[PDB]
Amino acid sequence: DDLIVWLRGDRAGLGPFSADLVDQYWRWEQDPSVLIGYGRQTPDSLENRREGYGHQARGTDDQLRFTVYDLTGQDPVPVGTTAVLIDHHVRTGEFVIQLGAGHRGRGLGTEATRLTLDYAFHVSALACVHLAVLTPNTGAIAAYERAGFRRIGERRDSGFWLGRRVSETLMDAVPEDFPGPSVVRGFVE
Amino acid sequence: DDLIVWLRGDRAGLGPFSADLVDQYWRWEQDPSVLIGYGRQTPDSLENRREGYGHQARGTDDQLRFTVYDLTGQDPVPVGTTAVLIDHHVRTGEFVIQLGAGHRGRGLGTEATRLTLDYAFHVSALACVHLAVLTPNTGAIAAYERAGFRRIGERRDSGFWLGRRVSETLMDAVPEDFPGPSVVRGFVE
Amino acid sequence: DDLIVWLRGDRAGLGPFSADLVDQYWRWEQDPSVLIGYGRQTPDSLENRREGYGHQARGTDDQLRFTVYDLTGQDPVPVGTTAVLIDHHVRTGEFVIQLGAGHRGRGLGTEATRLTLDYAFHVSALACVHLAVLTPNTGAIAAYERAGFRRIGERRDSGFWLGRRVSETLMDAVPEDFPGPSVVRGFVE
Amino acid sequence: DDLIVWLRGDRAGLGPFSADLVDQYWRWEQDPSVLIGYGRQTPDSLENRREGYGHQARGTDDQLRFTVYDLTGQDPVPVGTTAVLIDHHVRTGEFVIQLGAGHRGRGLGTEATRLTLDYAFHVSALACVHLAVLTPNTGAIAAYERAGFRRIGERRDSGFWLGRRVSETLMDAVPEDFPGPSVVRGFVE
Amino acid sequence: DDLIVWLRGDRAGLGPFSADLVDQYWRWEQDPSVLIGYGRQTPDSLENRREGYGHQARGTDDQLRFTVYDLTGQDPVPVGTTAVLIDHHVRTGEFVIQLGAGHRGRGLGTEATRLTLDYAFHVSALACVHLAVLTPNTGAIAAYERAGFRRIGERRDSGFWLGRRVSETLMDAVPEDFPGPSVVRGFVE
Amino acid sequence: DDLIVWLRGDRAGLGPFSADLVDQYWRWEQDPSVLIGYGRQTPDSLENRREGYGHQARGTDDQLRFTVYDLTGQDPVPVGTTAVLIDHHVRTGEFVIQLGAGHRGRGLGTEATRLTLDYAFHVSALACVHLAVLTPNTGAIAAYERAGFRRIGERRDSGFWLGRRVSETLMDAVPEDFPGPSVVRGFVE
Amino acid sequence: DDLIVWLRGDRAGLGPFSADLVDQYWRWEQDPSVLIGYGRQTPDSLENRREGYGHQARGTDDQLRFTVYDLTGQDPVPVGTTAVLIDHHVRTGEFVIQLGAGHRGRGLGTEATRLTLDYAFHVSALACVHLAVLTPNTGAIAAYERAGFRRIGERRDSGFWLGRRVSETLMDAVPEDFPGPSVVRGFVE
Amino acid sequence: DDLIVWLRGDRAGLGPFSADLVDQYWRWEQDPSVLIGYGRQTPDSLENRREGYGHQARGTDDQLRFTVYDLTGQDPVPVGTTAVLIDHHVRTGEFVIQLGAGHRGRGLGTEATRLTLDYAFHVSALACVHLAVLTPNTGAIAAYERAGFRRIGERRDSGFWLGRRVSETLMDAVPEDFPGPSVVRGFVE
Ligand SMILES: CC(=O)SCCNC(=O)CCNC(=O)[C@H](O)C(C)(C)COP(=O)(O)OP(=O)(O)OC[C@H]1O[C@@H](n2cnc3c(N)ncnc32)[C@H](O)[C@@H]1OP(=O)(O)O
Ligand SMILES: CC(=O)SCCNC(=O)CCNC(=O)[C@H](O)C(C)(C)COP(=O)(O)OP(=O)(O)OC[C@H]1O[C@@H](n2cnc3c(N)ncnc32)[C@H](O)[C@@H]1OP(=O)(O)O
Ligand SMILES: CC(=O)SCCNC(=O)CCNC(=O)[C@H](O)C(C)(C)COP(=O)(O)OP(=O)(O)OC[C@H]1O[C@@H](n2cnc3c(N)ncnc32)[C@H](O)[C@@H]1OP(=O)(O)O
Ligand SMILES: CC(=O)SCCNC(=O)CCNC(=O)[C@H](O)C(C)(C)COP(=O)(O)OP(=O)(O)OC[C@H]1O[C@@H](n2cnc3c(N)ncnc32)[C@H](O)[C@@H]1OP(=O)(O)O
Ligand SMILES: CC(=O)SCCNC(=O)CCNC(=O)[C@H](O)C(C)(C)COP(=O)(O)OP(=O)(O)OC[C@H]1O[C@@H](n2cnc3c(N)ncnc32)[C@H](O)[C@@H]1OP(=O)(O)O
Ligand SMILES: CC(=O)SCCNC(=O)CCNC(=O)[C@H](O)C(C)(C)COP(=O)(O)OP(=O)(O)OC[C@H]1O[C@@H](n2cnc3c(N)ncnc32)[C@H](O)[C@@H]1OP(=O)(O)O
Ligand SMILES: CC(=O)SCCNC(=O)CCNC(=O)[C@H](O)C(C)(C)COP(=O)(O)OP(=O)(O)OC[C@H]1O[C@@H](n2cnc3c(N)ncnc32)[C@H](O)[C@@H]1OP(=O)(O)O
């Protein structure tokens, strides 16, 4: 009962960024695959994440932070995190996502991204959500395309993939391109 | 016995803004339906609400904060919160209200608003209580009209409803329009 | 040359909220006619205004503050102040205005309000600008109507006019109702 | 002699971000045309810019700030500012530029951007410089293309131009696409 | 389960710099053989190491710190520490390593250094990793050569070995010289 | 008379790091040629150098800082700076040097480096002075070789020269290789 | 197992300056015989020693502090303390030693001093260790001579022995005079 | 008249450590010959000496600091500094002295040392004054011997002279060996 779920899809759900899961967040974020995908170069320390959680909690006015839940089992189980950094001046947000090691390839990222778009469009009233993703990270590309993002173009020589200088793909999503039924509309009506 | 009730109506009651219910207040306020109705765009964090409760408690000179109780059962059960921000210079207040997910449609909002008007008129000696409500939120409109509010007009393009730009309805209530018997008069006489 | 002018109309102009004019701002704001029109009940002290100017200058992210200039003479002469309090979450702002004692009835308020609407619509990208004005203040009503505001309705018994309890008129303006040519479009094109 | 010039082109030059010009920087940055082009919605206050200059000066490890000079006259005259925010983890920077009101259309922006690219590529050893520009700002588009930037694509509905929701163009530049002779190579050899 | 392992080789592995092992780190670092090899002249105090651990944890942006694990047994057992001090301006790092007294000569240092090179090249995207080692410390020389380092030369009279003034050997490693299969590539692909 | 000179050679001299020359030090250090030679990527701000001078002055226990003087004229004129960072544990120091734009190629760097070696060997009693220099910086190589440094080797891919990844040359000097007469011996005997 | 031993001789050993033994250190140091031998005139208080231990632990860069162990029994038992105050500028240290009341005359001081010399010469790379000892303290003289110290001379009238003004003997030791096998060489080879 | 003189000999005198001469003290102390003689390895900064003067002035309970005066001219002229660090527990002090560059070889050091001994013996009531001097510094040896010091012995390999490891000579002086008439006795009788 402690694990609150706000948005419930068919396969995934979103809930708040609970403080009981800060060590799990640290372990997910310091996985080498996530470091490669994000492009972070150094692991962070657990003490520093524990300290940073308080500042993350205080600064919530222009930031969405969710814990994604796998709803295929009897009870929800957290599988990753999603975040949108909101710029209230232009109604846009920047989207990032990562899942745990054992939860990838099962589709949870696609519906997690779709639910994040639903929340950002229909609760936050954002006009555009955009992301930057390293070009070789093709799985994320496909997940974002099916979630509702569209390709803008490639920013040449702007990241490292396994030490090699590679481009990164810029993608964006707009409310009129949002696929599938919206859970938030079900909440309101 | 810990749950203090000040005003007791037929279906609802009002009591103080107890500190034992801060987590319940957070869970009510972060529900997506309440976020849509209020027009808030980002969830707040539990730590930030816990911190803010102390400041809310200290600043009570020009602020009413109540917990609404359902009195239909054997014991009172809290179902929502009501607040009036008081401007002592002109004897007016701004009214907001929200209930929990499972308590809507049973009428508790109407008598909660009516009791809030009774307290604001007959204890706080306010000359006018007003509110701003998004136009598509028709249930709140009907509840406010039966509680004692009257429509002023529509403020065009001043809010978002499911990402769509919509108007909001301005309403106000005056003591000479207060319907039904007053509990506070029963307290005094 | 010290008096910077950003927007130049036919009769009026807008510039920044200069620190050399804080005493003039205090004298304008403490005039009994402005106190009656705004509904403020006590004069403020010059020391307190001098202290507050620094905090006003620091907090500029969601606030417009202009000094209105009379451009009918050889050089600009400041005649009043205009302000818009911006709510970035919904792209709306609340508008207030006052002129000095000897500058009223010459039309400067109308073009000052119109230029403020031009700036708020075409630079700040606001969807709605609204105001609250005491009903007996009919001159302000006419000035706002010709500037581009439209009447919403009356909030009953929500202010004092010469000690008498009176209503206040709510007005709003939208970009599609903005009259006349826009100076900002001339800046851009 | 006080105006230091580091890079000297045919028409323009770059020098340090001198503290004697903070008021001129404020006046340039608060011009309505620059506010429209950048997409900033509120003017900043002179006191706040004066305070911020110290923090800008202290934080120079990952930030380039230049004052652009017009070298067509007998002595250099500052005409604008250029900045690159450096991300040392991936050797990339984000580029912004603005000129004063009377210096546009004379070409100074093109060589200012080209010299900024020369410095960023050949002194800072950056692999990619990128920018975000509102689509209707076509003059900046042409200036950036001739300076050495190439178009990536359009980020849909991510900015306001005169209150209208418009897209913004993403551009980037790489060392192998840098046009013309490099001044920095002349410094070294 | 508390002992996290990120990189797993055949004989060794790398994990985070856990706080539960600060006393073990102190005992390893104060061993006379490690003091001779590093060239440190005075033992450090346990209280000072306990204090320093917090500062080491906070400063992780340009520093790699690993605990090396022996994976030959049923469960991982920590045997030493490796560190890379990163200079993000030029994509280079300085490498140091020490093992516990009973774990030397079994090969763990070679694969620990190789895995550190793998992480530094393929996650941190470093172009060069270099080290300084006292010339008489021939075992470390052989371990570094087989791990992937190459000899640069000798810095004359720049260290003490058992009180005698001796030279130190400078070595470096580049990605194109990295031997053997990379674990990180297995993580990504 | 204010310009103190400690060591006087035939062409050059060394004196203390006077506070009257902090702006001249800033202008020398921010020259693009010095930034290329040192490998620094961003200019520093004058305010930050002025602040840092106090901390540089306080920390003199393990640091040599000199201003080099040209003694060919009637009076000494400062032409550059030299520094040695001392590690008292092993009696070694790291050497850096830069001259002003108009003073290079006249030989002053060679005798400045030689006098710095004389001071470091015969006053500081250092056993080894070493340096790191980018390989394409051949003039510095020749100056250091004639001053008394000897080549160790090349550290591959450890710096940028005009944006290109290049190696850097490691050099060292020992007292028994110190060429020419020593001024310090003249001071003592 | 808590009692760490670094250097192990035939009769004695040296380990770190453990915090569990601060009261034992106080009791040893306040013994009247140690006060006479050192020449201290007043006892120190236990609270002051407990406070000072933290500062002693923090300042370890130029200070050796050991606890001497008697290794004749089954387990090590601490019998005294040895200290060397290091001057890193000239590679010299000043040596002091005291044992507990019941451990003198059994030889432990001689090997404790010899092991301290071994550590100071072969780990700290000191060129000279010296001491000052009151002339009537003949037992310490003999112990120091057999440990490896040689007599310099007598500093006349520079101490008190039982209230009488007496001279103190100055002694020093150099690596080339170090007697017996070195444990540290066994650690390294 | 500002230059106070306490002790007046035939050729030299001693006075207080005036604050008007802090820059002259810095210039004397940073002369390379004084650095060689004392054995200091790095010059100190003028700001640091100016800061340290206040702390030197406050701590005068166990410290003598004099400015030596040349009394051969019409008025006293300061030529150096002398200091005695007093250990009140045993009535002993450690003596140091340096003169300016142009005042050596004229005998002023001998009478300055003799007057310092007179003050230390007959005002401070010290039983022994001692010094440590590098062995090659033979002029200081002769000056100290004629002033009243006697040789104790040589501390082997405890200093550097022009980079060479040399011994230092230990000397001491006692009241019964004080040569010549005492000025202080003339003050008292
Ligand atoms: C915003 C940024 O900066 S990008 C950073 C992204 N974060 C990371 O990469 C960290 C590690 N990766 C992850 O956490 C996750 O993989 C995410 C969040 C990127 C989402 O990836 P997934 O959850 O696996 O996508 P998902 O599981 O919904 O399925 C995506 C589709 O991509 C396709 N796909 C998967 N892998 C590959 C591949 N290697 N190549 C091509 N296509 C692939 C599959 O068809 C898959 O459909 P299916 O798995 O449902 O059958
Ligand atoms: C002040 C502001 O800014 S408005 C913010 C209001 N807060 C929220 O909307 C948060 C979510 N909603 C709520 O918490 C509650 O619904 C409140 C506080 C608005 C009150 O709503 P309710 O308590 O359901 O009104 P209530 O239950 O007293 O009945 C209201 C009447 O509205 C009518 N009504 C209910 N839903 C609808 C609807 N979708 N359409 C039209 N009419 C409706 C019904 O006839 C109902 O009568 P009944 O339910 O007693 O039979
Ligand atoms: C936002 C709020 O809370 S309302 C607070 C308003 N502030 C104040 O009232 C302070 C004192 N008043 C003022 O500073 C100014 O009068 C303002 C800012 C309200 C603007 O008023 P004005 O500048 O005089 O309006 P303006 O001069 O542009 O002309 C307005 C028109 O109103 C009409 N008008 C003026 N007075 C009256 C009146 N007493 N009755 C009816 N109509 C009138 C006139 O036709 C006039 O047209 P004209 O003067 O150009 O010929
Ligand atoms: C990075 C960002 O976020 S974009 C923010 C850009 N900043 C601003 O827009 C603030 C206001 N504008 C400016 O300060 C300047 O115009 C800059 C910095 C954008 C550069 O613009 P300019 O300096 O005028 O470009 P420049 O003068 O070098 O010439 C650019 C070319 O664009 C072309 N051009 C100019 N105006 C237009 C126009 N309205 N439509 C189409 N093309 C145009 C011309 O052919 C011109 O060539 P020319 O003027 O040398 O004959
Ligand atoms: C970066 C610096 O500043 S150097 C500081 C290094 N740190 C230290 O020296 C502290 C003490 N030493 C250690 O901790 C470890 O010995 C390390 C980290 C240096 C690595 O040494 P090792 O782990 O023993 O190397 P490793 O075990 O992988 O084998 C190295 C090879 O060197 C060779 N080798 C070992 N000892 C010697 C020796 N005395 N002489 C010559 N060759 C030797 C062996 O052939 C060995 O192969 P093998 O042991 O697998 O059969
Ligand atoms: C320690 C480090 O990190 S290296 C950083 C060095 N700093 C810099 O490079 C900043 C800019 N450069 C300088 O300040 C100076 O050039 C220094 C300090 C490097 C010294 O260079 P110089 O003072 O010119 O050397 P110097 O003048 O004594 O003469 C050096 C010799 O190099 C030779 N030389 C000069 N230029 C070149 C060249 N481009 N190619 C080959 N050889 C050259 C000449 O024969 C010259 O002899 P000469 O000039 O007396 O006839
Ligand atoms: C550094 C300074 O300032 S000196 C301060 C020294 N500290 C103290 O004196 C405090 C009290 N004393 C002590 O703690 C210890 O006695 C120490 C540390 C000085 C060492 O003294 P010891 O450990 O007894 O010397 P040790 O036991 O190794 O033997 C020394 C030799 O001196 C000789 N000796 C002992 N006592 C005397 C004596 N009274 N007269 C002459 N010779 C003596 C013996 O032959 C002895 O050989 P042996 O005891 O092995 O048979």
Ligand SMILES: CC(=O)SCCNC(=O)CCNC(=O)[C@H](O)C(C)(C)COP(=O)(O)OP(=O)(O)OC[C@H]1O[C@@H](n2cnc3c(N)ncnc32)[C@H](O)[C@@H]1OP(=O)(O)O
């Ligand atoms: C306490 C310490 O740590 S020692 C540090 C001493 N400080 C310094 O050395 C700094 C530089 N030197 C000085 O400041 C001064 O020389 C001092 C303070 C050491 C005193 O030296 P002086 O004042 O020259 O001694 P003084 O002038 O009184 O005469 C000393 C005698 O030494 C003899 N002497 C002088 N130089 C030499 C020499 N190179 N070799 C042998 N004998 C010499 C002379 O016979 C001289 O007699 P005279 O000069 O009166 O005819």
